[PDB]
């Protein structure tokens, strides 16, 4: 009841905090079902291992930032149209000054 009432008012931080420290297993197992993403290397089209940033066959790093050109080991933002992205706070700042994919593929990533 508490979780539903919190979700009505759109307070996800408190709802997830409650789910994390819940005393019952059924509630604790709510944000664990189907929250895992599978990512693949677009040069070789092969699945990537669960922990690492270097491809197994191409021997190339694939989590390259499209703005700062460093290796992304943490949070990664992604565009579903042209399949490009980078650091969470780099693309966010780039996209409030321009309307082009920073990798330069002629895409208007927000369609505006």
């Amino acid at each position: 009841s508490y979780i539903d009432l919190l979700q009505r008012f759109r307070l996800w931080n408190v709802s997830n905090e409650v789910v994390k420290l819940s005393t019952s297993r059924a509630v604790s197992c709510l944000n664990q079902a189907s929250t895992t993403l599978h990512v693949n290397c677009s040069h070789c089209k092969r699945p990537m291992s669960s922990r690492g940033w270097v491809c197994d066959r191409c021997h190339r790093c694939a989590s390259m930032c499209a703005v700062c050109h460093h290796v992304v080991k943490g949070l990664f933002v992604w565009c579903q149209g042209c399949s490009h992205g980078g650091h969470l706070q780099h693309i966010m700042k780039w996209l409030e000054g321009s309307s082009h994919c920073p990798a330069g593929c002629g895409h208007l990533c927000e369609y505006s």
Binding site: L37, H38, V39, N40, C41, S42, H43, P47, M48, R60, A62, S63, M64, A66, V67, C68, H69, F76, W78, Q80, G81, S83, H84, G85, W94, G97, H100, P102, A103, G104, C105, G106
Partner: protein, 74 residues
Amino acid sequence: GSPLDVLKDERVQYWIENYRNLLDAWRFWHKRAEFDIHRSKLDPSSKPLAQVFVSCNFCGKSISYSKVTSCPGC
């Protein structure tokens, strides 16, 4: 506006890549993207960066490019 025959000479590409690396070293990162846009508009021979993509759990295919929410394949 050079022809596609001379842009394929492996001496212009070396110069372009060296300039891009110089721009990277000085930490001029928005200028490099600005240059990349104007270079991809004119010269279409070179492909952009290659990165990761997200794949469906039941097919194995890519979800890149009819509910907006469901996989385009299955």
